[PDB]
Ligand binder design. Sequence first.
Ligand SMILES: *C(=O)[C@H](CCSC)NC=O
Ligand SMILES: [Mg+2]
Ligand SMILES: [Mg+2]
Ligand SMILES: [Mg+2]
Ligand SMILES: [Mg+2]
Ligand SMILES: [Mg+2]
Ligand SMILES: [Mg+2]
Ligand SMILES: [Mg+2]
Ligand SMILES: [Mg+2]
Ligand SMILES: [Mg+2]
Ligand SMILES: [Mg+2]
Ligand SMILES: [Mg+2]
Ligand SMILES: [Mg+2]
Ligand SMILES: [Mg+2]
Ligand SMILES: [Mg+2]
Ligand SMILES: [Mg+2]
Ligand SMILES: [Mg+2]
Ligand SMILES: [Mg+2]
Ligand SMILES: [Mg+2]
Ligand SMILES: [Mg+2]
Ligand SMILES: [Mg+2]
Ligand SMILES: [Mg+2]
Ligand SMILES: [Mg+2]
Ligand SMILES: [Mg+2]
Ligand SMILES: [Mg+2]
Ligand SMILES: [Mg+2]
Ligand SMILES: [Mg+2]
Ligand SMILES: [Mg+2]
Ligand SMILES: [Mg+2]
Ligand SMILES: [Mg+2]
Ligand SMILES: [Mg+2]
Ligand SMILES: [Mg+2]
Ligand SMILES: [Mg+2]
Ligand SMILES: [Mg+2]
Ligand SMILES: [Mg+2]
Ligand SMILES: [Mg+2]
Ligand SMILES: [Mg+2]
Ligand SMILES: [Mg+2]
Ligand SMILES: [Mg+2]
Ligand SMILES: [Mg+2]
Ligand SMILES: [Mg+2]
Ligand SMILES: [Mg+2]
Ligand SMILES: [Mg+2]
Ligand SMILES: [Mg+2]
Ligand SMILES: [Mg+2]
Ligand SMILES: [Mg+2]
Ligand SMILES: [Mg+2]
Ligand SMILES: [Mg+2]
Ligand SMILES: [Mg+2]
Ligand SMILES: [Mg+2]
Ligand SMILES: [Mg+2]
Ligand SMILES: [Mg+2]
Ligand SMILES: [Mg+2]
Ligand SMILES: [Mg+2]
Ligand SMILES: [Mg+2]
Ligand SMILES: [Mg+2]
Ligand SMILES: [Mg+2]
Length: 109
Amino acid sequence: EEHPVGEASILATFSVTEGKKKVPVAGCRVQKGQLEKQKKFKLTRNGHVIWKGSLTSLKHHKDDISIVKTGMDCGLSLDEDNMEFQVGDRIVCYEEKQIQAKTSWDPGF
RNA sequence: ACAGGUUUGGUCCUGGCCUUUCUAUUAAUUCUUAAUAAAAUUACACAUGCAAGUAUCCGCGCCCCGGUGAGAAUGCCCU
RNA sequence: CACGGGAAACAGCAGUGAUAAAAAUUAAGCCAUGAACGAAAGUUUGACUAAGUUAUAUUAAUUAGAGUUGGUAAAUCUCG
RNA sequence: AGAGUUAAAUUAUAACUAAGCUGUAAAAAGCCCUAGUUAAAAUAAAAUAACCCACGAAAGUGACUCUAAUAAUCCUGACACACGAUAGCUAGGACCCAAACUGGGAUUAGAUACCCCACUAUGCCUAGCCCUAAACCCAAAUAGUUACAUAACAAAACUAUUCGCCAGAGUACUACUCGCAACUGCCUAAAACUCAAAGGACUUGGCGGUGCUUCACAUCCACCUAGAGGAGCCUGUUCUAUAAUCGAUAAACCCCGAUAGACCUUACCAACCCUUGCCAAUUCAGCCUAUAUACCGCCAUCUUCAGCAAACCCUAAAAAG
RNA sequence: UAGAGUGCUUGAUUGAAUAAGGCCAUGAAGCACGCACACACCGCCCGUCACCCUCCUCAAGCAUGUAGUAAUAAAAAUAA
RNA sequence: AGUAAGGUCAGCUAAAUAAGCUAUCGGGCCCAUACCCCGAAAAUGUUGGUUAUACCCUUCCCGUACUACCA
RNA sequence: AUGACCCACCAAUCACA
Ligand SMILES: *C(=O)[C@H](CCSC)NC=O
Ligand SMILES: [Mg+2]
Ligand SMILES: [Mg+2]
Ligand SMILES: [Mg+2]
Ligand SMILES: [Mg+2]
Ligand SMILES: [Mg+2]
Ligand SMILES: [Mg+2]
Ligand SMILES: [Mg+2]
Ligand SMILES: [Mg+2]
Ligand SMILES: [Mg+2]
Ligand SMILES: [Mg+2]
Ligand SMILES: [Mg+2]
Ligand SMILES: [Mg+2]
Ligand SMILES: [Mg+2]
Ligand SMILES: [Mg+2]
Ligand SMILES: [Mg+2]
Ligand SMILES: [Mg+2]
Ligand SMILES: [Mg+2]
Ligand SMILES: [Mg+2]
Ligand SMILES: [Mg+2]
Ligand SMILES: [Mg+2]
Ligand SMILES: [Mg+2]
Ligand SMILES: [Mg+2]
Ligand SMILES: [Mg+2]
Ligand SMILES: [Mg+2]
Ligand SMILES: [Mg+2]
Ligand SMILES: [Mg+2]
Ligand SMILES: [Mg+2]
Ligand SMILES: [Mg+2]
Ligand SMILES: [Mg+2]
Ligand SMILES: [Mg+2]
Ligand SMILES: [Mg+2]
Ligand SMILES: [Mg+2]
Ligand SMILES: [Mg+2]
Ligand SMILES: [Mg+2]
Ligand SMILES: [Mg+2]
Ligand SMILES: [Mg+2]
Ligand SMILES: [Mg+2]
Ligand SMILES: [Mg+2]
Ligand SMILES: [Mg+2]
Ligand SMILES: [Mg+2]
Ligand SMILES: [Mg+2]
Ligand SMILES: [Mg+2]
Ligand SMILES: [Mg+2]
Ligand SMILES: [Mg+2]
Ligand SMILES: [Mg+2]
Ligand SMILES: [Mg+2]
Ligand SMILES: [Mg+2]
Ligand SMILES: [Mg+2]
Ligand SMILES: [Mg+2]
Ligand SMILES: [Mg+2]
Ligand SMILES: [Mg+2]
Ligand SMILES: [Mg+2]
Ligand SMILES: [Mg+2]
Ligand SMILES: [Mg+2]
Ligand SMILES: [Mg+2]
Ligand SMILES: [Mg+2]
């Protein structure tokens, strides 16, 4: 079961040069909830879902921070280079909890 | 072995594999009756019954027969 | 090896679990041979004798089915 | 094995002279502190003789001189002993010239090659290792014979005494062991598994960017003439296109089946129609349906190529010639 | 062919140039030589890589099973 | 962000007749593919200005080596 | 420079009574 953790809207897109590699950076503002580094993420464009996966780098003001709270600005670089970050995109951080099912079989007796 | 098939476009040589014979176990398919012979997966575990007594007391018999091939290169033959 | 120790013994005849491709009777007699004991008549003996079971093999007849038919290697026709 | 020596080259290095020298099928790069001549140590390597066939156990040894020297009254014999080409390793010395590597230059689709230039390890000396070669004259040592006698090819066939080896092919000069100055090593040397062959020699073809001869007569080069390939048309292919045939489709198709399509032709497409439906008869006519890889008929092609083939005969065996 | 070609098949007219060489590249013949080819060079064939599968080996380690020698004492006696 | 060279065709390059090598398509060669040999199309980045010329200067884009700095 | 795989020789007549 996928239950939601946090949601953040992108604002500005940056190109940062580290180790001779241009890294697209999504500047984000966390609206409702929080974002955590280990959780799974999905990107949302005007109601569509563009991407599924985990960040490469979540970095906030020259510090790498595992958990950004609400109202916190956070830089986000994905591992997927094919992903395009626009000015108005939405981002949903979700966590997966495990539901343990019992037998669908009930013996008559 | 009285031999035969098979290397190659072909021939010779060399060289393996296989066929043909005979027996035993198992299996498949078939199966009428006798006789004789033989009876065999297992040194894994065993319900029950029987397998050692005789005899005027002592005594004498009681893995001898029977079982098995576990172990051991054990050993054969011979002093 | 067997003082000891694991532990509670069919590798006697039958049987039975397990196991394996592997499947004989939980049978009758001491009448004959052998063995034990007895001075002896005799008793005992799943040794054994006579039977039961089984195409495992031979033989005898009452029994016909299996395999094979391109070559080696006996033997074929029409369909699919 | 020692010690000593050096003729021909080559080079450091000067002296003149010249602007180039080097280098290839052809260039480039390199060098001009280069080249030619005249002078020259060291180092390394040993024309001719050798058309000889000697020495050594083998590996090996062919400039000159001297010293020392080539086991056994001579059968075979190891895993024991002592040696063992090149490469390679360690340490010290040498360095003319050659040269793995590497760097440049060409070449090429690429070229981590062949070709060009530079230069190194290394080739040399001393000392120690290493122990391998197509270490193959693929033919064991020692005595013999030339009798019997052809698988093939090759270097003719064999006896006796020995020793060493070999039991399909791969897997495999591999994996594991033991030993070894070897540590990417040598030696010794399996099995699972896979296959139904793997090998040896020959035969006739075909082929060969193999060599030597001889040619080409519209024929390859050399050469002559007129054209094609560019334009417009004509006509055929291929595609694409259509509801809308088929066949040819390297040489050996492409104004080809057609010396011939407006209807017909005609096989195609679309609508419609007809079911003993060309004929003397026939549970029969009819089919331009499939197969040209079942065929006959006609041909193309090698080809203006010279061979094919029956019947025989010959060959210490014959596939064939 | 009724008609349909710049096509085809035939007849005729005017009417040249060059070749007297070459074996280096192409091709042909003969002879040598080679062949791992024989569907016969449009032949055959080698290794990586890629896709699966089989089997051996080597593995830090882990399970289960597996046992030794050393000197002794023991031949001495009591009571009847 | 600054700096310096720069921008000629899809890629690199020459010059000022707008061209040559690869890429691309199309022909040819070959029994056939590939190499190879030809042919075609392919533009001086958009703004502005001139002149006997644009390879002069500017605007707005651009990129690149170099520095700084970027979540 | 290159050019899937696969291709081949293992059966006997006619005629007469
Ligand atoms: C990064 O540092 C962040 C910038 C994103 S806002 C566009 N601000 C704070 O963490
Ligand atoms: Mg063979
Ligand atoms: Mg054959
Ligand atoms: Mg044989
Ligand atoms: Mg049975
Ligand atoms: Mg016994
Ligand atoms: Mg033993
Ligand atoms: Mg015991
Ligand atoms: Mg029993
Ligand atoms: Mg007992
Ligand atoms: Mg049972
Ligand atoms: Mg049985
Ligand atoms: Mg039964
Ligand atoms: Mg009795
Ligand atoms: Mg009695
Ligand atoms: Mg009884
Ligand atoms: Mg010197
Ligand atoms: Mg030069
Ligand atoms: Mg000399
Ligand atoms: Mg001597
Ligand atoms: Mg000797
Ligand atoms: Mg040596
Ligand atoms: Mg050396
Ligand atoms: Mg040295
Ligand atoms: Mg040197
Ligand atoms: Mg040199
Ligand atoms: Mg080079
Ligand atoms: Mg010396
Ligand atoms: Mg030699
Ligand atoms: Mg040898
Ligand atoms: Mg010898
Ligand atoms: Mg043999
Ligand atoms: Mg083997
Ligand atoms: Mg070797
Ligand atoms: Mg080895
Ligand atoms: Mg071993
Ligand atoms: Mg001509
Ligand atoms: Mg004309
Ligand atoms: Mg023309
Ligand atoms: Mg034309
Ligand atoms: Mg057509
Ligand atoms: Mg047809
Ligand atoms: Mg056709
Ligand atoms: Mg043809
Ligand atoms: Mg018509
Ligand atoms: Mg009509
Ligand atoms: Mg029809
Ligand atoms: Mg034909
Ligand atoms: Mg003739
Ligand atoms: Mg002959
Ligand atoms: Mg003949
Ligand atoms: Mg006409
Ligand atoms: Mg040869
Ligand atoms: Mg052959
Ligand atoms: Mg070839
Ligand atoms: Mg290829
Ligand atoms: Mg082929």
